[PDB]
Write a protein that binds this ligand. Structure first.
Ligand SMILES: *[C@@H]1O[C@H](CO)[C@@H](O[C@@H]2O[C@H](CO)[C@@H](O[C@@H]3O[C@H](CO[C@H]4O[C@H](CO)[C@@H](O)[C@H](O[C@H]5O[C@H](CO)[C@@H](O)[C@H](O)[C@@H]5O)[C@@H]4O)[C@@H](O)[C@H](O[C@H]4O[C@H](CO[C@H]5O[C@H](CO)[C@@H](O)[C@H](O)[C@@H]5O)[C@@H](O)[C@H](O)[C@@H]4O[C@H]4O[C@H](CO)[C@@H](O)[C@H](O)[C@@H]4O)[C@@H]3O)[C@H](O)[C@H]2NC(C)=O)[C@H](O)[C@H]1NC(C)=O
Ligand SMILES: *[C@@H]1O[C@H](CO)[C@@H](O[C@@H]2O[C@H](CO)[C@@H](O[C@@H]3O[C@H](CO)[C@@H](O)[C@H](O[C@H]4O[C@H](CO[C@H]5O[C@H](CO)[C@@H](O)[C@H](O)[C@@H]5O[C@H]5O[C@H](CO)[C@@H](O)[C@H](O)[C@@H]5O)[C@@H](O)[C@H](O[C@H]5O[C@H](CO)[C@@H](O)[C@H](O)[C@@H]5O)[C@@H]4O)[C@@H]3O)[C@H](O)[C@H]2NC(C)=O)[C@H](O)[C@H]1NC(C)=O
Ligand SMILES: *[C@@H]1O[C@H](CO)[C@@H](O[C@@H]2O[C@H](CO)[C@@H](O)[C@H](O)[C@H]2NC(C)=O)[C@H](O)[C@H]1NC(C)=O
Ligand SMILES: *[C@@H]1O[C@H](CO)[C@@H](O)[C@H](O)[C@H]1NC(C)=O
Ligand SMILES: *[C@@H]1O[C@H](CO)[C@@H](O)[C@H](O)[C@H]1NC(C)=O
Ligand SMILES: N[C@@H]1[C@@H](O)[C@@H](O)[C@@H](CO)O[C@@H]1O
Length: 251
């Protein structure tokens, strides 16, 4: 088989929390899995989660350039394409570039060294966007399988972020899906194939819109929309602000 194996396969339906805006400073949410930023959290934060019985997924952006990272000057001018429409100071990456791929290997080394149980590589759906680099589905498939073989070789699990079109070509290498907004877009059937193969969907809904972040609950009908869809009992849903700060509501 042209995939590699992972030792940690989280169960379908495992409750999770994700917080990417700042260093994690709240573990009061009783979730089994925490998805947090790879760079801004130290080994101590990660080990503390695991000592409390939790698994830690480390987020990083595999397909976009973030101009505030400490390794940003490793990227060459030719690695960078167009701006991401909805994220400031981010640009699409040429994920076929050997330089880009080596930078990502360096980020997986760091995730391994910090004790991450898994990695959550973002922005592998450049083909679905104005990337300015002629990126294609095959490029993403090649890149996602490259990341998965590299994470597995470092004893970490991995999952697919959105990128619904390429599921059949990477799923054997994936331990889960991270999906945004499939309920709002009536697309959760696309991602149900993961729990049909014993793999969770870590599923995010943003009912408050892309410009509103606060600590208030959503309305009952916004919660029904985020939570009620065929097979939702197999999705691990969080309701979040668009900025992915601490605030979270569960179904
Ligand atoms: C985990 O870590 C995170 C990250 O560090 C913690 O979150 C951070 O917490 C800080 C302290 O609470 C906040 O600092 C306050 O910021 C207020 C608004 O700042 C705006 O602009 C910044 C610019 O960068 C921006 O980042 C902010 O955006 C965030 O919020 C929006 C939503 O609004 C999101 O969309 C966005 O994505 C970000 O999440 C934000 O828009 C600022 O007003 C504060 O300075 C004020 O307030 C201080 C305390 O005010 C208190 O006043 C009354 C008494 O009068 C008190 O009883 C009450 O508790 C009030 O809180 C005060 O010390 C300052 O001197 C200043 O006071 C003046 O202004 C107020 C109001 O106008 C007047 O009442 C007052 O008399 C003075 O005139 C703070 O600087 C960070 O924003 C926040 N960062 C985030 C969320 O990203 C988080 O808490 C941690 N969680 C834990 C520990 O559990
Ligand atoms: C390892 O090596 C292999 C090389 O062998 C690498 O390639 C991948 O290998 C996979 C394993 O064999 C392979 O996986 C899948 O195998 C399934 C068998 O169960 C297939 O059924 C999958 O088919 C895909 O396409 C289906 C058909 O889609 C057309 O038809 C439907 C029917 O109406 C349309 O809806 C659909 O829109 C589409 O129509 C378009 O295209 C037509 C063809 O050109 C055309 O006639 C139309 O006019 C229209 O333009 C589709 O139904 C499948 O999607 C289902 O499944 C996913 C989850 O898998 C769900 O999310 C969906 O909701 C839906 O239920 C599926 O997309 C598929 O072949 C995989 O394809 C190979 N990938 C390649 C070659 O790129 C592999 O990558 C290597 N690595 C690893 C780790 O494996
Ligand atoms: C993205 O990176 C890839 C890999 O470096 C580039 O593809 C190479 O392009 C040169 C010149 O066209 C060819 O000689 C190589 O054979 C290509 N390699 C591969 C693996 O395809 C690609 O040009 C880059 N994309 C952009 C838009 O610059
Ligand atoms: C790899 O991770 C698993 C967690 O599922 C752990 O049990 C195992 O000891 C790890 N192996 C190494 C060499 O760290
Ligand atoms: C969850 O997935 C299982 C397959 O593992 C399926 O049999 C079941 O119907 C799904 N649950 C719901 C509520 O659809
Ligand atoms: N890549 C960034 C990520 O680092 C985080 O800031 C997030 C909001 O928390 O926005 C984007 O996804």
């Amino acid at each position: 088989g042209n995939y590699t194996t992972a030792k940690w396969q989280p169960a379908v339906g495992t409750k999770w929390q994700i917080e990417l805006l700042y260093a994690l400073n709240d573990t009061s949410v009783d979730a089994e899995i925490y998805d947090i930023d790879l760079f801004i959290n130290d080994k101590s934060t990660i080990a503390g989660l695991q000592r409390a019985g939790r698994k830690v997924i480390c987020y990083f952006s595999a397909g976009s350039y973030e101009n505030w990272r400490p390794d940003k000057d490793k990227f060459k001018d030719s690695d960078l394409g167009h701006d991401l429409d909805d994220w400031p100071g981010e640009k699409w990456l040429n994920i076929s570039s050997a330089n880009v791929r080596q930078i990502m290997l360096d980020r997986l080394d760091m995730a391994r060294d910090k004790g991450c149980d898994g990695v959550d590589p973002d922005n592998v759906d450049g083909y679905d966007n104005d990337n300015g680099l002629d990126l294609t589905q095959a490029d993403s498939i090649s890149f996602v399988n490259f990341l998965a073989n590299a994470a597995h070789a470092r004893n970490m699990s991995i999952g697919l972020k959105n990128a619904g079109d390429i599921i059949p070509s990477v799923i054997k290498n994936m331990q889960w899906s991270v999906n945004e907004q499939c309920a709002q877009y009536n697309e959760c059937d696309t991602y149900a194939v993961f729990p049909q193969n014993g793999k969770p969907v870590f599923h995010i809904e943003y009912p408050k819109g892309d410009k509103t972040n606060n600590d208030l609950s959503v309305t009952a009908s916004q919660k029904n929309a985020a939570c009620d869809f065929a097979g939702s009992a197999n999705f691990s849903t969080v309701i979040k602000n668009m900025n992915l700060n601490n605030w979270v509501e569960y179904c």
